[PDB]
Amino acid sequence: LDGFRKWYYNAAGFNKLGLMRDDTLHETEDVKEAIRRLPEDLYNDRMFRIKRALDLTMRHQILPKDQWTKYEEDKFYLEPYLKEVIRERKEREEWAKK
Amino acid sequence: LDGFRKWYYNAAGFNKLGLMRDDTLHETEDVKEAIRRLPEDLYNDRMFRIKRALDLTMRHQILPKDQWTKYEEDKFYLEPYLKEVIRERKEREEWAKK
Amino acid sequence: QDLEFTKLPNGLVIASLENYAPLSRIGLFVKAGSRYEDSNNLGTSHLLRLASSLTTKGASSFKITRGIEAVGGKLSVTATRENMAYTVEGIRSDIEILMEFLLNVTTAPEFRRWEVAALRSQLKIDKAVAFQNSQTRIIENLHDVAYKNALANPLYCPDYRMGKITSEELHYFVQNHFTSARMALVGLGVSHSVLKQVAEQFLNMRGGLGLAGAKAKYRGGEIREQNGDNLVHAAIVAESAAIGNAEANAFSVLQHLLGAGPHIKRGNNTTSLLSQSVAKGSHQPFDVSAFNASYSDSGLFGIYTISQAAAAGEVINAAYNQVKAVAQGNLSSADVQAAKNKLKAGYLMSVETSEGFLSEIGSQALAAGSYMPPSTVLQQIDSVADADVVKAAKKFVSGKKSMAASGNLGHTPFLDEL
Amino acid sequence: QDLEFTKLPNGLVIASLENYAPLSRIGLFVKAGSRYEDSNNLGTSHLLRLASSLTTKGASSFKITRGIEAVGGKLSVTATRENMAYTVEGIRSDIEILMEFLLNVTTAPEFRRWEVAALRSQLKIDKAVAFQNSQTRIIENLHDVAYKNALANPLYCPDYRMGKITSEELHYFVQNHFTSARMALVGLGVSHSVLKQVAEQFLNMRGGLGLAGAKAKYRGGEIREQNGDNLVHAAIVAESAAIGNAEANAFSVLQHLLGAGPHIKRGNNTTSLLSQSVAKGSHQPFDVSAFNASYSDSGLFGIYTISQAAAAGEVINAAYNQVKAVAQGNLSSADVQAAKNKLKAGYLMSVETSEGFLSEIGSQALAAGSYMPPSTVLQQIDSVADADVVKAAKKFVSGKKSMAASGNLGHTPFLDEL
Amino acid sequence: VAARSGPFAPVLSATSRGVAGAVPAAPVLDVAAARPLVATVGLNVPASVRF
């Protein structure tokens, strides 16, 4: 399962643009709240990675293979911050039903 | 000529709405610059007189005859301020011409 | 049921009174005022005061706010330069979860960075609302010019420090001043037992004595604020007695002799020696009173004047001259007896209400660890005697003064002229 | 040729020098600084300084701007606490209309209310640009804490007075301080005759002596404003001599002995007894100099320090200790000779430029009505002798000090500790 | 601050109620030494301060 997940990570292809997994999340309301709660350096790296991926997609290029994002290396930075947004979101919801 | 000017002042009919002569001027750029240079009390009386005239025109009424604006009493307040706007305006124009 | 004041081993001073009241009140008192900051973390206590509804380890901000409003209870934070007090009140059937919320807020905050980043704008708004009146600004200026390090720190956050207070500063302040030896949990309308059980599930883990504050040092001086107000506000104070001395009782008797607020609506507060000494010479509107603020290491006593800018000078002089008369022994025993009656009636009406009673017990706890029955006080105030009052006066008339003035100060005198 | 002077019977001073320069400058000097306001019209001189391009009775604003820019000339306003100076400069073939514009601006303003209402936002912008650096704020604070009434008035308008300065206040200030007995018209590159002849078209309207200004009174006091700047800009001054008194010079020799500032770029070290006394103990970056500001009734002399907040204390102490050594006679004659050479070279390089020469003549005119040839001064500075310098020092070392501090002031000392 | 200050109490006691005229909505400019300040402003010449 670990090797097949690495093979699917190579087949997804966002590592060839230098992106992380959390860069590829669709910005819903909860995702934008999690992005807003990021520290400044992580937010700046995320915006630069997104801009570089957009530029590479503009020129129809990819990064060189040494510059790709290694599956093992990818960091799920937004995840911790996101869970909270969802948790808080759900809590408010249940309370609504009260 | 003085009596015929009073007769024309009665025939114009803005005194029946309580307006002054300078309230009836069309607000061009020079007129708005002269209005902006007015003191606060004169500006507030002008805005109240215009609002009262608009309300009277809404109800298709006029003021009672004792409350009309006597030709002799009308004050050309905006005039002094206006001349300047025109003078300054012309001076600037001339400078550009030359 | 006399307060069952008991000091748990750690240091927490638990106290309670089962008044069998419909609406109870439970407060927690910490020696964590604004005097415990230094020049590197100014305004941290203001953000800590405004950060009582933040996410805690045990309850979120949404859960705390909706749970306190669900039972209709109230959570408030009152802060002086020495002490902070977090108070909850509500129906007896909901004070269990009210103590859950309050003890979570006191003991286990999280201080998330996005929450404090949202709170700094509220900090600016609260400071503007607080400085909408001249008395607050002139007292903050008076403390800033009167003291050097400790009591000179403002209750409200400075303008440059907004945007600079971090989560780490709040965590450091809480970890260094919210310890069990500086805390008293006081409950009116509750059983003492429960206070103790909540005092072990909470309030017992942080048990150091914390970070000791610096001794406050007097400096003197005068700060003036020309801002074009219609009335000139001026406070002239000097160093006085601290909490825990009979000279503090003498200074309280001295402010009630000089005048400490009107008792009659639209009265002229006839008796106030100050008010009389001003009103015999000036027909302009005025308001002259005596100011006294005593903290556990130092006190400020002086005069407070509001007057028309023009007369601002001699009115201040007249008020000052009246205190000099009291410094020369020019007083009557009936006036001192009336001052004692005014002071003791003010104390009894201060403790007549439930939240004032809870605050008093709280303060006494942190200050002396003991409860002083209202009765005891009455006889101690009586202990103050005429000469004692005179003595405190001479202290004021001699000690270097500190002057905070604001308004149109073209005719407001200086300290070397005063 | 040489400078040539006439005092007109209405009191106006006329000074001219025809050196056949290609660009000629003409300035007009009025004793109408910020010291002539009181608490009711603070900031009026700032709006008067910024209101030099407003429609004058003689010339509309458009012309007063388009006519000066049409010939490429320059109109500027420089203001101290005592004096205002309106200066125009341009080609000799256009200085007739330049004098028309300048004398219309000085003598016959209109001060229309919509123009000053538009100018108050520029007043706020100019104050913000001026207080972008710490020195300006600390010198304004130092003057405010050092003086009581006259020289304590700020050069820049206070925040509350914006929006409140009217046309009537400007008209009253002009009618009470822009009179012929307080004015000198100084022209480099022009014939004296024309200045005399341009002094009749205008400068004839107000022949009074103006509304004289109150005598400035010293107050002392120390003000500290935590602002965050890592550097604690601290100025500690005391009362010193007036411009005229011989002691004055002695104080100028004393600041050039204790350092007058840097004389080398990126390498200005060990240029001051002060700098040496700080640098022998502190390895942090610093900037210590001597401050001297003398006006016609009173002067301020002291030390100015910029340093890291932490070392701010002992650095200030070290600088203070150095002055105490000069107060004990611990100085050498070669050091005083080098200080005299530095002072006289600074004076000659100040008067070597055309606008500095015009300002100097102007100042001398208003101050003493006479021109003092650069040579004369040189021998008077030489008159100052070693003991004289020592004397001024003891004046500073003893006289009540006034302290303005800004930055992170947790380790900045007070006056009773200093 | 119950018997010591009385009327002056509310000046020394913030009381943020936390849960449970009004404030009236309470600048960036374009970009040492010692000597008496001397402000300068010019018709076209940008202003300056030579302290």
Swiss-Prot record, chains C, D:
GO MF terms held by the record: metal ion binding; metalloendopeptidase activity; protein-containing complex binding
Similarity-based family: Belongs to the peptidase M16 family. UQCRC2/QCR2 subfamily.
Lipid bilayer topology: Peripheral membrane protein
Domain of life of the native organism: Eukaryota
Record carries keyword Repeat: no
Post-translational changes noted in the entry: Acetylation of Lys-124 and Lys-215 is observed in liver mitochondria from fasted mice but not from fed mice.
GO terms classed as biological process: cellular respiration; mitochondrial electron transport, ubiquinol to cytochrome c; proteolysis; response to xenobiotic stimulus
UniProt keywords, alphabetically: Acetylation, Electron transport, Membrane, Mitochondrion, Mitochondrion inner membrane, Phosphoprotein, Respiratory chain, Transit peptide, Transport
Tissues expressed in: Expressed in neurons and astrocytes of the cerebral cortex and hippocampus (at protein level).
Primary residence: mitochondrion
Organism: Mus musculus (Mouse)
Its biological purpose: Component of the ubiquinol-cytochrome c oxidoreductase, a multisubunit transmembrane complex that is part of the mitochondrial electron transport chain which drives oxidative phosphorylation.
GO cellular component: mitochondrial inner membrane; mitochondrion; myelin sheath; nucleoplasm; respiratory chain complex III
Assembly: Component of the ubiquinol-cytochrome c oxidoreductase (cytochrome b-c1 complex, complex III, CIII), a multisubunit enzyme composed of 11 subunits. The complex is composed of 3 respiratory subunits cytochrome b, cytochrome c1 and Rieske protein UQCRFS1, 2 core protein subunits UQCRC1/QCR1 and UQCRC2/QCR2, and 6 low-molecular weight protein subunits UQCRH/QCR6, UQCRB/QCR7, UQCRQ/QCR8, UQCR10/QCR9, UQCR11/QCR10 and subunit 9, the cleavage product of Rieske protein UQCRFS1.
N6-acetyllysine carried by residues: K31, K164, K215
Protein name, UniProt field: Cytochrome b-c1 complex subunit 2, mitochondrial
Residues with PTM Phosphoserine: S333
Source organism phylogeny: Eukaryota, Metazoa, Chordata, Craniata, Vertebrata
Cell compartments where the protein resides: Mitochondrion inner membrane
Gene: Uqcrc2
Family annotation (Gene3D superfamilies): Metalloenzyme, LuxS/M16 peptidase-like
UniProtKB/Swiss-Prot annotation, chain E:
Recorded coiled-coil stretches: none
Function per UniProt: Component of the ubiquinol-cytochrome c oxidoreductase (cytochrome b-c1 complex, complex III, CIII). UQCRFS1 undergoes proteolytic processing once it is incorporated in the complex III dimer. One of the fragments, called subunit 9, corresponds to its mitochondrial targeting sequence (MTS). The proteolytic processing is necessary for the correct insertion of UQCRFS1 in the complex III dimer, but the persistence of UQCRFS1-derived fragments may prevent newly imported UQCRFS1 to be processed and assembled into complex III and is detrimental for the complex III structure and function.
Subunit record text: Component of the ubiquinol-cytochrome c oxidoreductase (cytochrome b-c1 complex, complex III, CIII). Subunit 9 corresponds to the mitochondrial targeting sequence (MTS) of Rieske protein UQCRFS1. It is retained after processing and incorporated inside complex III, where it remains bound to the complex and localizes between the 2 core subunits UQCRC1/QCR1 and UQCRC2/QCR2.
Name of this chain's protein: Cytochrome b-c1 complex subunit 9
Lineage: Eukaryota, Metazoa, Chordata, Craniata, Vertebrata
Residues of the full protein shown: 4 to 78 of 274
